Write a protein that binds this DNA or RNA. Structure first.
Lengths: 97, 43, 72, 85, 60
RNA sequence: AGAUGGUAACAUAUAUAUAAAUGAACUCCUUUACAUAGGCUUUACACUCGGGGUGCGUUUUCUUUGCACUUUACCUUUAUAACAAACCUUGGAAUCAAUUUACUUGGAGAAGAGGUUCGUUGAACUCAAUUCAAAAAUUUGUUUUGUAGCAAUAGUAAUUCGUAAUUAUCCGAAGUGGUAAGGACUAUCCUUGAAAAAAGGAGGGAACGGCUUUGUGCUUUGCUACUCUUAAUACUUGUAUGAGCGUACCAACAACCGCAUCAGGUCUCCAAGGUUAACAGCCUCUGGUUAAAUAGAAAAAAGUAGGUAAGGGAAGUCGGCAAAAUAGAUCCGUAACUUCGGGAAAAGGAUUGGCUCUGAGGACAUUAAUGUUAACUCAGAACUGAAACGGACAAGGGGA
RNA sequence: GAGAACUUUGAAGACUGAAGUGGAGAAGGGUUUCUUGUCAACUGUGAUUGAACAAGAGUUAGCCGCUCCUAAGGGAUAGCU
RNA sequence: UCUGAUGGAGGAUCGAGUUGAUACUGACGUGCAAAUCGUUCAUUUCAAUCACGUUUAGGGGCGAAAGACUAAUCGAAAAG
């Protein structure tokens, strides 16, 4: 199964970056409660504008929104940004109002 | 109560109607007045 | 409300002079499933079509004397 | 195990009322709550329904009897004299 | 002044009278509103909100 | 001139709509229609757990996280499914058996096997339609669709768009037993726990086709495709659907009664979470409120409502008045006397937290053996702490 | 608003604690209901509030009830006093 | 006869609520109140509690009996 999180609008406005996002996911998603045992079942790939998360185990899409909120809170963008779903397998970053 | 007889309701309506002040054009030339909480109809 | 399954009874009820309107409901399921509902004096009769072709043919064969109500 | 030495069914009354009164009521409650022989079906399953009415659980047939027993000696004797003739 | 609007907002939002919030500024528009229709429209535009219910978690 | 299936229990009219299965007088029943107690059980609602989705919240640190929504009415004899019962057919029981928590039942016919019905419920069960193979001049197995119709078009929670419309979700499994109702039972009465309106069933068998014709409804001659039941229409019938009355609000907290906007009195239903035996107490969510014939400041005497007090412990007082003393639960132990039932929580002892463990108590399948999965309920052991743990709340003083 | 401790709004701290100042009814009340004004008196302090005062308005049923039935019982008829 | 379970009787027990009212002879006693408030106490499967309806009317009624109650009125109500 495959999930997409897009940050096109914020990284276009140059408030976010993809490398930090991808590293945060790589060292933040825990499988079997362990931070860095994702190994071969769960992997994440980077795009110039998107972030791909390919999963091979039961997994909640809400995790991506939770971690994205965590990142944009620790980097003081929480009060400008929101995570809104688009399709069955897609989140995207949006602005307020 | 909410449940009423026709005659009782008509009496209540008449008692309400008789509770209005004297018209000003008539005063240009009333004591039988009651408040629902002070003097009970008893009827 | 009554559901009718066979097609002959549905056609007969539609042709019966007491019917006034036919309600056409169409909706996606997973393919769009539809249902045709004849409004009579007594009951509203529903027939459920999974077959898109069948539910294209049947209301066309339905006589246009009686009115149509498309809900979606 | 054995629960009460002698009061039996009158243990429901506790210590109230006299011991003589409780023993007297035990003697008659024993037969008021007993099952009797139904002579219509032969099964010992006729129990008291009201004060003078006794119904068989099997027959569903009910007879008029004593207040506390299916029969009383006076009625039994009277029936005996009648049936002698 | 805004008691009528509070009552109507509670009725149309199907929430408690204590759970509706009026914009502290721009209360003149709210006072102008005097029907379910107006209350609904300017709730939609955001002058009245429904406060979230107090949190009662079962984590513990 | 009045239908038919099943051995039987009984069943059958599915027309748009199961409307019609002849039936008089006179009858005989049933429903309406009924107490209390106890547990057992089923269902719905309630509550709760986990998964998926959507939105929000926390984010110095931690948090696959905390919260909210994720809905489905009446009606369709709702069809079916399931279950407690009763009944029918077959069967023919002691080595008695079946069976309940409990006892209940049987040669007046049990168990087993196969059926019928009612009542619970109200889409359960492949339920209905549909796709594929095997049976024959129409049956059994395999897939898709649909929240079974109502029904998504409504509701809810979201994302957008001029400011009315678009879009996406509304589905995967369970646990506790609070409330309500039903069921099948057992028990109690020197107590046996309404009636009628209304409705239904039965026994009975009074009356009997049509067109035409003789004589005086009857015998008669010649011919036969005919009687009821639902719905619609047309015309007659006085105008050939749905009368009248109540419906706001309070119900006490200022709308009632207490002379009042009076700390009083005044009937009924719903009843969340935590702790817990608990609808107790205490705290909390939804809903409601922050109001009470006043406020501010100061803060002595005295009053009133409480706390705490060294040592002594009823010396106080008419009198232990008032207060204090434990008081939950588990384990142990319990006298005189006795109507043998009690006394009794007699008296009187011990333990109780937290944490980490150990043991015991069930359900579901495969060809004696191996996996999946659920409640809280007990028992025991280490460790731990200012020796404290029914830590607040709640809660016997005993004895002669 | 002339005037604000007791009118309204927002924020906070709290309370009621589903045996509730939460929702529905009965008895009783009778317009206290709603809207708009409004403050002479009343609302035991204030008051711009109000169950006060003033002007208007508001109660929609074949299916919720009464209406029907009978009960404890009441009245009346026939008589008889 | 004895033992363990099962069972669920009783004008049985504790106890909220209800229904009352033991004590403080507490507060109040120009009360919130012409009987209230607080704590304490009694009561909860039955001779139980409540509502509405209905019957009994004054030298009469009604009384698990205090001369109690019979609309703040009782060793004879209230009105004229």
């Amino acid at each position: 199964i495959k999930y997409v999180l897009d940050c096109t609008k914020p990284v276009k406005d140059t408030i976010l970056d993809i490398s930090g996002l991808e590293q945060f996911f790589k060292d933040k998603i825990k499988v079997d409660k362990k931070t860095n045992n994702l190994k071969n079942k769960v992997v994440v790939t980077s795009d110039e504008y998107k972030i791909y998360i390919t999963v091979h185990i039961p997994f909640s899409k809400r995790y991506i929104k939770y971690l994205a909120k965590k990142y944009i809170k620790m980097h003081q963008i929480r009060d400008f940004l929101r995570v809104i779903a688009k399709g069955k397998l897609a989140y995207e970053f949006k602005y307020f109002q | 109560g909410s449940i009423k007889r026709f005659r009782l309701k008509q009496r209540l309506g008449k008692c309400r109607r008789q509770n209005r002040p004297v018209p000003h054009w008539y005063r240009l030339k009333n004591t039988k007045r009651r408040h629902w909480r002070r003097t009970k109809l008893g009827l | 409300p009554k559901q009718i399954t066979d097609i002959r009874k549905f056609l007969k009820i539609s042709r019966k002079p007491d019917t006034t309107a036919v309600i056409i409901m169409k909706k996606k399921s997973k393919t769009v499933i539809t249902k045709l509902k004849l409004r009579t004096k007594k009951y509203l009769y529903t027939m459920v079509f999974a077959d898109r072709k069948k539910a294209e043919r049947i209301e066309n064969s339905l006589l246009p004397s009686l009115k149509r109500i498309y809900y979606p | 195990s054995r629960r009460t030495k002698k009061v039996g069914l009158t243990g429901k009354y506790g210590t109230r009322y006299g011991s003589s009164l409780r023993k007297q009521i035990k003697k008659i409650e024993l037969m008021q709550h007993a099952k009797y022989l139904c002579t219509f079906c032969g099964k010992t399953a006729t129990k008291r329904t009201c004060v003078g009415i006794w119904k068989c659980k099997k027959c569903k047939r009910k007879v008029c009897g004593g207040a506390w027993s299916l029969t009383t000696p006076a009625a039994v004797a009277a029936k005996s004299t009648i049936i002698r003739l | 002044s805004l008691t009528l609007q509070k009552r109507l907002a509670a009725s149309v939002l199907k929430c408690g009278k204590n759970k509706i919030w009026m914009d502290p500024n721009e209360i003149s528009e709210i006072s102008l509103a005097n029907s379910r229709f107006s209350i609904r429209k300017l709730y939609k535009e955001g002058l009245i909100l429904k406060k979230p219910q107090k949190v009662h978690s079962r984590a513990r």
